[PDB]
Paper text:
The cow antibody repertoire contains a unique subset (~10%) of antibodies possessing ultralong CDRH3s, which can reach lengths between 50 to 70 amino acids. The unique CDRH3 structure can be separated into two microdomains where the antigen-binding disulfide-bound “knob” sits on top of a long b-ribbon “stalk” and can bind to both surface and receded epitopes. Ultimately, we isolated a total of 8 and 11 cross-clade nAbs from cow-485 and cow-488, respectively, all of which had ultralong CDRH3s, suggesting only ultralong antibodies were responsible for cross-clade neutralization detected in sera. BnAbs from cow-485 were named Bess, while bnAbs from cow-488 were named ElsE and assigned numbers based on their order of discovery.
To compare the binding interactions of the Bess antibodies with structurally characterized V2-apex human bnAbs, we determined a ~3.3 Å cryo-EM structure of Bess4 Fab in complex with BG505 SOSIP, in which 41/57 CDRH3 residues were resolved, allowing for atomic modeling. (A) 3.3 Å cryo-EM reconstruction of Bess4 Fab in complex with BG505 SOSIP and RM20A3 Fab (used to increase orientation sampling). The Bess4 CDRH3 forms a knob like structure, stabilized by 3 sets of disulfide bonds, and inserts down the Env apex 3-fold axis at an angle between three N160 glycans. This angled approach is similar to human bnAbs PG9, PG16, and CAP256-VRC26.25, in contrast to PGT145, which binds more perpendicularly with respect to the viral membrane. Strikingly, despite coming from a different species and containing unique genetic properties relative to human bnAbs, Bess4 makes contacts with several residues also found at the interface with PG9, PG16, CAP256-VRC26.25 and PGT145. 3D variability analysis of the EM data reveals significant movement of the rest of the Fab relative to the CDRH3, suggesting that CDRH3 makes all the critical contacts with Env, and contributions from other parts of the antibody are minor. Bess4 and ElsE2 neutralization titers were knocked out or reduced 30- to almost 400-fold for Bess4 and ElsE2, respectively, when mutations at position N156, N160, and K169 were introduced.
Numbering used by the authors:
A (entry chain B): 520 to 545, 568 to 664
B (entry chain A): 32 to 57, 66 to 141, 150 to 185, 188 to 309, 312 to 323, 323A, 324 to 396, 412 to 457, ...
C (entry chain C): 2 to 52, 52A, 53 to 82, 82A, 82B, 82C, 83 to 100, 100A, ...
D (entry chain K): 520 to 546, 568 to 664
E (entry chain F): 520 to 545, 570 to 664
The structure:
């Protein structure tokens, strides 16, 4: 499989196996239990894809944005984050700022998308 | 530095989760059609430089299996013959033919008036019953123990009670983590964790006091408890080597089919062929003594190098918890075990066993099941792979039992279910 | 750290010359690298830049259609394939480490290490 | 404003809350089936909308511009009235009869554009 | 032509009905839920696969993976003007997973390369 093989790797050693994890997301009571598990997996997948969509990251695994990084979220340089830290440690480190970052991403896409509409209205 | 938020999808990050697991497997109570085939080449990916905290006492996989096993049990019994018409006054006498003293008073010959194919005509039939299944009313008048608490369903004679390995497999978006840290004590950090598609096959072996046909410890005997200093908690002991136990029901039985009504029949125990002996189990004495010595040393590691450790038989209570209960060839044995826990630490052992046909499976009131007799002579050879002990200058340990969740904890202690959180963000120097 | 250039020599106008650079003392695959020219009597001129992985190459316009920059991370080497040489290409060609970045590490935009240089005469 | 808060606002006041409504489209055996039917229906409706955006060349966007000209036969109004006076409910009513016509044209223009793109990355 | 109407048409005679067929990918009653759930998962795997190849949102997607002559040594006219998609699917079935693997690797390199071109400044 290779699934989660990079879990113990550093952030810059990992994030090259993104398709490995991405492809692993996809008697009446037994049928119901199985359908609930399958429907839930589908709903979670679609919510994550919708979230990437509204940020302007649809169809990508590594998506660049226009949101500046705040030093209050993590006061670390790139060498520590990408060469020493793992993704599990990073997830713990910035858990409390996740929704703030997500909100900013949504707002920047809303401005960018509208700006494109105005640029395409010239001529 | 000028850093920007970069969004990643497919990040190898997970969080603790509780979900519904499915069942994989290779006419049977548990090998049901709902379960799907296993992967002929199971995958396991070792996670290097990963330490994950495990807690076998809060593992939702144990509760799910407990519920699923009970559900499969009831679904298996649902279509079988109901024996409500059997709850009639019995006229019982003792069986005195070729009876050894060990069996004197244990087996009764009961005659009764029961219905037949037609509702108007009745028939006079007889059946042999074990003392444990029949309660005296009002010398010769008896009733079944289930008459004042619940209707009883006869188990289907064609459906095996043999445990079949069941593998639990995660749905997509979730993962099962395996603790490969030898000598893991059931709680806390576990280095050397691997990700698997599913667990190994776990046989739903039902037993009390002694754990049969389970997994063995890789190097040392393991002593595990939620709180080792709390005498209200059970201690699970995992053996390094199995102790072989040879259990038998030596009497050669036959079976009489007595029709109750259209398409329905009750299976009565017929006359016994040959001599009547009791049931028993032979536990190798030298192996057992060595096994206890190992258990005592491991207990001393928690209770003190100079603490006296004594084994004693269980305290009183229901037969299902005071004896070693198990299903051997379709018969339910209730073995004394007192000969195994009778020593203080500082040829074979023969354990007498009783057979009961009316089984209240799972610690429930009602939903009784009647086990039909099995023809011939029953012999089982099993591996004892662990113990459930309770703690009473000197510490005393006694066989414990019940709950059933502990038997499944003894196998699922190394597995954890997590959910995958594929999204994450991190600073980079890349601007859109 | 060491960077040792090879190749070089005198090639007549219109010919082709291959330069190479052997690196040691650092992880080769972790740094972007470049080739820089120094005219025999003037200053330094940047010619080409290659990323750490080798997938991205950049050239100065004066050589954009004539030079190819290549990297082989299994041998710790750089190479430069120089076609259609003209009199204006006479120079010392230095192998240098630095110049670009890999996005997930601090930027450089400077040259950290230099070799001794190959002399190319047209 | 929250979910549908802009429903009574003008078309140009709305079309800035699209993520608010967009995020609300995804989120005893008889009760099991009833809940599953509700969840499966929500998923299928979402996917059909996304498939339409895909085949029109609008995947991943909430606002996308196209190459289909507006026909005066569908709505003979200028932008000042449509965007500053009208609401989206009134607009939906006004062009309901032409919805499938517009959809067909959008599909057709993407089919031409996609092929046109294929024939340009082929040069050289 | 409607759904599968172009099935017998040549590869270059089809490749114009892709939207028509794309539209058709989307108690006892549990059977219907199973049938509906399966369709959704199958649809999503294909969309996910297109996503990882960088082909999301498109019906025709050009890539940077060279065609290996060992997979099918034909002259393009043979493929697009004479052959149908069913015959083609049979001809290269053995190499489908190889092609898919290459496509995934190609996108990963391009995605990293794109990132490396978006912090130059
Ligand atoms: C721990 O694990 C061990 C295995 O390692 C278990 O031991 C086995 O236990 C079973 C049940 O007691 C033994 O019996 C076998 O039962 C099979 C099923 O019975 C069929 O046939 C009867 C006929 O009346 C039907 O009523 C029934 O519905 C089934 O159709 C039989 O098929 C087996 O027969 C095979 O083995 C015997 C060996 O004596 C041969 O003579 C036969 O020809 C045939 O090859 C068998 O009767 C089984 O034998 C035990 N295995 C071993 C190796 O001894 C333990 O029970 C388990 N412990 C616990 C607590 O579960
Ligand atoms: C089956 O039913 C018959 C009829 O009731 C029982 O026989 C009766 O037994 C009582 C005992 O006090 C006598 O007084 C009756 O005269 C008997 N009647 C007949 C017709 O025999 C018989 O005992 C029942 N059998 C069982 C096993 O319960
Ligand atoms: C069902 O009948 C059994 C058999 O009598 C009852 O068990 C007895 O309960 C009394 C009262 O607790 C005890 O003193 C006896 O020792 C029990 N055993 C016997 C053999 O009498 C049981 O309580 C009854 N249950 C119900 C719900 O009526
Ligand atoms: C357990 O061991 C006893 C012996 O202690 C076995 O009983 C013997 O069985 C043989 C059978 O051929 C007889 O000849 C002996 O006379 C028996 N001895 C005694 C003391 O009873 C018994 O069969 C064994 N049971 C199992 C299941 O292994
Ligand atoms: C069980 O009890 C019966 C009597 O109730 C014993 O006798 C047999 O009973 C059946 C009744 O169906 C008769 O058909 C047989 O003819 C009776 N036997 C004889 C010799 O007359 C029966 O033997 C007892 N069985 C055991 C194992 O104790
Ligand atoms: C674990 O750490 C060691 C430290 O020497 C390193 O060599 C190894 O590559 C690390 N494992 C992974 C998967 O990166
Ligand atoms: C970072 O967040 C704090 C609030 O926690 C805010 O005051 C500050 O201005 C932010 N800085 C940047 C650069 O976004
Ligand atoms: C998040 O906030 C809680 C307090 O509410 C704090 O205990 C925790 O450490 C914080 N986490 C981080 C990563 O700062
Ligand atoms: C069975 O035997 C016991 C003695 O063990 C005796 O007390 C009892 O009355 C007997 N019952 C019958 C029905 O003979
Ligand atoms: C298991 O071992 C850990 C040490 O790694 C200890 O903290 C914990 O209390 C132990 N638990 C039991 C039940 O012995
Ligand atoms: C174990 O039980 C004792 C009872 O006195 C209690 O003091 C102790 O805190 C318990 N430990 C745990 C880990 O629950
Ligand atoms: C169990 O029976 C086998 C024969 O099948 C015998 O070899 C073995 O020694 C017996 N074990 C015990 C503990 O009696
Ligand atoms: C059990 O083994 C110990 C030695 O570890 C020995 O002293 C003791 O007598 C043995 N007991 C029996 C019943 O063989
Ligand atoms: C108990 O004995 C072991 C040797 O088996 C020894 O290592 C340990 O230190 C002893 N502990 C005490 C408290 O004497
Ligand atoms: C435990 O053993 C003693 C001594 O033989 C006995 O009196 C007692 O009844 C036994 N307990 C049980 C529950 O069998
Ligand atoms: C087990 O055997 C002992 C032998 O002394 C006896 O006292 C005890 O009552 C027996 N227990 C059972 C449940 O038969
Ligand atoms: C326990 O050991 C003593 C030793 O004298 C013996 O008399 C007694 O019968 C034994 N009990 C059991 C149940 O083995
Ligand atoms: C039981 O007795 C019957 C008598 O016909 C015989 O055929 C059968 O083999 C016997 N079974 C055993 C296990 O002794
Ligand atoms: C008991 O364990 C041993 C371990 O080697 C195994 O070979 C044997 O088959 C097991 N016995 C049973 C009945 O499972
Ligand atoms: C409702 O209409 C008034 C003008 O009559 C306007 O000021 C107000 O913003 C409108 N409501 C919303 C939610 O836009
Ligand atoms: C507008 O629609 C009418 C049909 O109502 C049609 O005749 C006319 O050609 C269309 N014009 C354009 C530009 O699409
Ligand atoms: C749609 O057409 C019907 C006639 O079939 C007409 O009555 C209705 O008003 C039309 N709707 C619009 C919005 O023009
Ligand atoms: C079927 O084949 C004939 C030539 O044999 C061709 O003219 C016709 O167009 C084909 N059918 C379709 C739907 O293309
Ligand atoms: C083409 O495929 C063959 C067979 O797998 C392989 O040996 C060869 O290297 C491939 N060539 C290219 C350019 O992919
Ligand atoms: C695919 O492989 C099979 C052997 O498994 C072979 O018979 C068949 O010809 C192959 N097809 C192609 C197109 O290479």
């Amino acid at each position: 499989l290779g699934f989660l093989g990079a879990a113990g790797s550093t952030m810059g050693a990992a994030s090259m196996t993104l398709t490995v994890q991405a492809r692993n997301l996809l008697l009446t009571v037994w049928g119901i239990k199985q359908l609930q598990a399958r429907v839930l997996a589908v709903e979670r997948y679609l919510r994550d894809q919708q979230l990437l969509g509204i940020w302007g990251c649809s169809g990508k695994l590594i998506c660049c944005t226009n949101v500046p990084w705040n030093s209050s979220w993590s006061n670390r340089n790139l060498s520590e984050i990408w060469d020493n830290m793992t993704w599990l440690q990073w997830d713990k480190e910035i858990s409390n700022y996740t929704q703030i970052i997500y909100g900013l991403l949504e707002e920047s896409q809303n401005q960018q998308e509208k700006n494109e509409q105005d640029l395409l209205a010239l001529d | 530095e000028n850093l920007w938020v970069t969004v990643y999808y497919g990040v190898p990050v997970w969080k603790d989760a509780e979900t519904t697991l499915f069942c994989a497997s290779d006419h049977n109570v548990w090998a049901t059609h709902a379960c799907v085939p296993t992967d002929p080449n199971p995958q396991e990916i070792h996670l290097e430089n990963v330490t994950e905290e495990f807690n076998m006492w809060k593992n939702n996989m144990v509760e799910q299996m407990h519920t699923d096993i009970i559900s499969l049990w009831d679904q298996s019994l649902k279509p079988c013959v109901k024996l409500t018409p059997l709850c009639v006054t019995l006229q019982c006498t003792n069986v005195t033919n070729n009876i050894t003293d060990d069996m004197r008073g244990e087996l009764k010959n009961c005659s009764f008036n029961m219905t037949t194919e037609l509702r108007d005509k009745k028939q006079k039939v007889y059946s042999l019953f074990y003392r444990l299944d029949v309660v005296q009313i009002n010398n010769k008048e008896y009733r079944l123990i289930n008459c004042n608490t619940s209707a009883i369903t006869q188990a289907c004679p064609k459906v095996s009670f043999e445990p079949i390995p069941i593998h639990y497999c995660a749905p997509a978006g979730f993962a099962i983590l395996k603790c490969k840290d030898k000598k893991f004590n059931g709680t806390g950090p576990c280095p050397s964790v691997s990700t698997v598609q599913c667990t190994h096959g776990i046989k739903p072996v039902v037993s009390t006091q002694l754990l049969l046909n389970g997994s063995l410890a890789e190097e040392e005997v393991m002593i595990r408890s939620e709180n080792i200093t709390n005498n209200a908690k059970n201690i699970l002991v995992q053996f390094n080597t199995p102790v072989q136990i040879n259990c038998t029901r030596p009497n050669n039985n036959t079976r009489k089919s007595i029709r109750i009504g259209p398409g329905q029949a009750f299976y009565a125990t017929g006359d016994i062929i040959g001599d009547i002996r009791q049931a028993h189990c032979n536990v190798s004495k030298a192996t057992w003594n060595e096994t206890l010595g190992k258990v005592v040393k491991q207990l001393r590691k928690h209770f003190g190098n100079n603490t006296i450790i004594r084994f004693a038989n269980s305290s009183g209570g229901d037969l299902e918890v005071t004896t070693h209960s198990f299903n051997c060839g379709g018969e339910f044995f209730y073995c004394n075990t007192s000969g195994l826990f009778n020593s203080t630490w500082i040829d074979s052992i023969t354990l007498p066993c009783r057979i009961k046909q009316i089984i209240n499976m799972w610690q429930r009131i009602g939903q009784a099941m009647y086990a039909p007799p099995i023809q011939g002579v029953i012999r089982c050879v099993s591996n004892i792979t662990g113990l459930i002990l309770t703690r009473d200058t000197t510490e005393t340990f006694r066989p414990g039992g019940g709950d059933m969740r502990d038997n499944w904890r003894s196998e699922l202690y190394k597995y954890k279910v997590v959910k995958i959180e594929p999204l994450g963000v991190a600073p980079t120097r890349c601007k859109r | 750290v060491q960077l040792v250039e090879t190749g070089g020599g005198l090639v007549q106008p219109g010919g082709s010359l291959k330069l190479s650079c052997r690196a040691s003392g650092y992880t080769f695959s972790s740094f972007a690298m470049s080739w820089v020219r120094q005219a025999p009597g003037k200053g330094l001129e940047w010619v080409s830049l290659i990323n750490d992985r080798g997938g991205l190459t950049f050239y100065v316009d004066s050589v954009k259609g004539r030079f190819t920059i290549s990297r082989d991370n299994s041998k710790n080497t750089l190479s430069l394939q120089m076609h259609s040489l003209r009199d204006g290409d006479t120079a010392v060609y230095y192998c240098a480490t630095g110049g670009m970045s890999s996005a997930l590490q601090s930027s450089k935009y400077y040259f950290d290490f230099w070799g001794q240089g190959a002399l190319v005469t047209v």
